[PDB]
Design a protein around this ligand. Structure first.
Ligand SMILES: NC(=[NH2+])c1cc2c(I)cccc2s1
Lengths: 9, 248
C-alpha cells in the first residue's frame, strides 16, 4: 500500500 | 556472496540493482544499493568513482535475476548522483564510502510500494547493534573469488558483527579499520560478501526494525580467515544523509 520501512510481505 | 542461499527480491524488497550502459549495446552490473525513501537509493562511492557520469547508469527495483526480467520490476534513471566529499582509498580500505542516487522513472516518478519493492529503515544517530548480532547481506556478487562472472539469481547469507577490537588486531586489518567502519564475519569463515556485492546492505534488527546497519565496502579476499568484510557504518553518516535527502 504505502512504504513501511523494513517490512517484507 | 560466498555461501548463502539463493533468494528472490520478496525477501529483500529494498535491494536496488545498479547497472551501467555502454556505447556498444551492453549493460553490465555495477553494484548493489538500498532504497531509503521513494526517490533515494544509497550505495557506495567506490562504485561510481571511476565513471561519475549519472546519465549512463540504470537502477532497477524488484529484481530477483541479474540479466532477465522479474515481473514487478521498476527501471529508473539517476537524476542525482552524490558521492562523498572526503572519499579516500588506500591499499585496502575505502573511507567515507557512501553514495546517494536520486532516481526518476521515465514518467517522472519515484518508487511505488509493492510486494517486491519496500524501503529499509535507517538507524538513529550512532546507534548500532552490539557485536555478536547476526545480520544478513544480499547481492549478485561473486560466489568464489576466482570466478569472473556473477550469478543470475540473487543470494543472501547471514554474518555476525564483530567488535572493532577484534578487527583492528594486527593479524586482521590493524588500523585500516576506523570507527566509521564495521566488520562482520562468519565464526567459521564460511560465508561472506565479495566483489560485485559492493554498495549493498548489511541489515540487522535494531529496536524492533530491520535496519540498514552497513553498506558492503571492502575486504581482503572473500571468506578468508581473519579477513572480515568491512562495511560503511551508516549510523555515523546520518547528518550527511540528512543534509542531502528531502520530501517523498
Ligand atoms: N571480504 C569481503 N567481504 C569483501 C571483499 C570485497 C572485494 I575482493 C571487493 C569489493 C568488495 C568486497 S567485500
Amino acid at each position: 500500500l504505502k512504504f513501511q520501512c523494513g517490512q517484507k510481505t | 556472496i560466498i555461501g548463502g542461499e539463493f533468494t528472490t527480491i520478496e525477501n529483500q524488497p529494498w535491494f536496488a540493482a545498479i547497472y551501467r550502459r555502454h556505447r556498444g549495446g551492453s549493460v553490465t552490473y555495477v553494484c548493489g544499493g538500498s532504497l531509503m525513501s521513494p526517490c533515494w537509493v544509497i550505495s557506495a562511492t567506490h562504485c561510481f568513482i571511476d565513471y561519475p557520469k549519472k546519465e549512463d547508469y540504470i537502477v532497477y527495483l524488484g529484481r530477483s535475476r541479474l540479466n532477465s526480467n522479474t515481473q514487478g520490476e521498476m527501471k529508473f534513471e539517476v537524476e542525482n548522483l552524490i558521492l562523498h566529499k572526503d572519499y579516500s582509498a588506500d591499499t585496502l580500505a575505502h573511507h567515507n564510502d557512501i553514495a546517494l542516487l536520486k532516481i526518476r522513472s521515465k514518467e517522472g516518478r519515484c518508487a511505488q510500494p509493492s510486494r517486491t519493492i519496500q524501503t529499509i529503515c535507517l538507524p538513529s544517530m550512532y546507534n548500532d547493534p552490539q557485536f555478536g548480532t547476526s545480520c544478513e547481506i544480499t547481492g549478485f556478487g561473486k560466489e568464489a573469488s576466482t570466478d569472473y562472472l556473477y550469478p543470475e539469481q540473487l543470494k543472501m547469507t547471514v554474518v555476525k558483527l564483530i567488535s572493532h577490537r577484534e578487527c583492528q588486531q594486527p593479524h586482521y586489518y590493524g588500523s585500516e579499520v576506523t570507527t566509521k567502519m564495521l566488520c562482520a564475519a562468519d565464526p567459521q569463515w564460511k560465508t561472506d560478501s565479495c566483489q560485485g556485492d559492493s554498495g549493498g546492505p548489511l541489515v540487522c534488527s535494531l529496536q524492533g526494525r530491520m535496519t540498514l546497519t552497513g553498506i558492503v565496502s571492502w575486504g581482503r579476499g572473500c571468506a578468508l580467515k581473519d579477513k572480515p568484510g568491512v562495511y560503511t557504518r551508516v549510523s555515523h553518516f546520518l547528518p550527511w544523509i540528512r543534509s542531502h535527502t528531502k520530501e517523498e
